[PDB]
UniProtKB/Swiss-Prot annotation:
Belongs to the proteasome subunit S11 family. GO terms for molecular function: structural molecule activity. SMART domains: PINT (SM00088). Pfam families: PCI, PSD13_N, Rpn9_C. Present with 12400 molecules/cell in log phase SD medium. PANTHER family: 26S PROTEASOME NON-ATPASE REGULATORY SUBUNIT 13. GO terms for cellular component: cytosol; nucleus; proteasome complex; proteasome regulatory particle, lid subcomplex; proteasome storage granule. The keyword Nuclease does not apply. Acts as a regulatory subunit of the 26S proteasome which is involved in the ATP-dependent degradation of ubiquitinated proteins. It comes from the Eukaryota. One of its GO terms (biological process) is ubiquitin-dependent protein catabolic process. This is 26S proteasome regulatory subunit RPN9. Keywords: Proteasome.
């Protein structure tokens, strides 16, 4: 019987420990547990979880109450109740052992349970709790183990298992916890290309989420110190979603000009949108380089060039003969060609080009 046993003890104690405001809600909690209605009990417990009021009660609740029926209820509902109470502790190692032990219980409590059709379904609960262990690691549990686990989990973002988008999006937070566009934008653009590979029709995302992903990828390319090929980005189907909002149409036309060497359109957007935005202003002198670099690379590719002259490069860049070689020396430094400058003759011996 629940009377004179753990459950009566828990209801009694937690009602005393609780704020008076919580008392009427816990009548439904008591009832639905006694009725064996774990799901209605979870709605009642979710209505408690929805408020910061008395959050620590949920730790005892998890340990001594939810643990009796967590096999039936949704894995993320279960971990959310523990998460709020264990986050209140401001600790990053008990949280590790708790999420690992909880996850491992579900790894043995289930084999064909909570599945779409008693099938080899996605582990669309503990796959995200695995990310929560990783976030907890990256939250300075131990930096060496965290960095090693980050590298191993990055090597696990592949079709080695039937990973859904949600685990990758969850681990993408853990990558963002370690590296950002502020550290390097070319890297963050390539990190964003990972997320594109996982994008498919999923409840996780919308057309608006695609618009935000396209826009953030666009900033990452624009400000990418070593990116040059904006064309493959600008043509990619994900960049069609933003054409159905166009709030940033000026960015995509600045990008378009920067994809074709249209100095006049470039200058016209540069005269306005740079001044309005400090992040873009910090890169203005890179963008004017990027247009010159790409204009020449297109010229080299389309005209299959092997020899060019500083005066003709000066036409194609609007940089004076006295400095124009430093521009193509940046291109050589980007590694997108194997040519060499012949400064003695004010010539260049161009060789090869990276198309993408």
């Amino acid at each position: 019987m629940f009377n004179n046993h753990e459950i009566d003890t828990i209801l009694s104690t937690l009602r005393m420990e609780a704020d008076p405001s919580l008392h009427p809600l816990f009548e439904q909690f008591e009832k639905f547990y006694e009725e064996k209605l774990w799901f209605q009990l979870s709605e009642s417990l979710t209505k408690f979880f929805d408020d910061a009021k008395s959050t620590p009660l949920r730790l005892r609740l998890y340990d001594n109450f939810v643990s009796k029926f967590y096999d039936k209820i949704n894995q993320l509902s279960v971990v959310k109740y523990l998460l709020a109470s264990l986050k209140d502790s401001k600790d990053f190692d008990e949280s590790l052992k708790y999420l690992d032990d909880l996850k491992a219980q579900f790894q043995e409590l289930d084999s064909k349970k909570q599945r779409n059709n008693g099938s080899k379904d996605h582990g669309d609960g503990i796959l995200l709790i695995d990310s929560e262990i990783a976030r907890t690691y990256l939250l300075k549990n131990d930096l060496v183990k965290a960095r090693d686990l980050l590298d191993d989990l990055e090597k696990t973002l592949d079709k080695k298992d039937s990973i859904p988008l949600r685990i990758t999006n969850s681990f993408y937070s853990t990558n963002s916890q370690y590296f950002k566009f502020k550290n390097d934008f070319n890297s963050f653009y390539y990190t964003s290309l990972l997320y594109l590979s996982t994008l498919e029709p999923s409840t996780s995302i919308t057309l608006a989420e695609r618009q935000q992903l396209a826009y953030d990828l666009s900033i990452s390319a624009l400000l990418g110190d070593k990116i040059y090929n904006f064309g493959e980005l600008l043509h990619h189907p994900i960049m069609e979603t933003i054409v159905n909002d166009s709030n940033y149409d000026w960015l995509f036309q600045l990008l378009n000009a920067l994809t074709v060497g249209d100095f006049d359109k470039f200058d016209s957007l540069i005269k306005v949108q740079i001044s309005k935005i400090p992040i873009l202003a910090q890169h203005e002198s890179f963008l004017r380089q990027k247009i010159c670099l790409m204009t020449l690379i297109e010229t080299v590719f389309v005209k299959n060039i092997r020899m060019l002259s500083f005066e003709d490069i000066s036409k194609a860049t609007h940089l004076p003969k006295d400095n124009v070689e430093h521009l193509v020396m940046r291109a050589i430094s980007l590694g997108l060609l194997k040519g060499s400058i012949d400064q003695v003759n004010e010539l260049v011996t161009i060789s090869w080009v990276q198309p993408r």
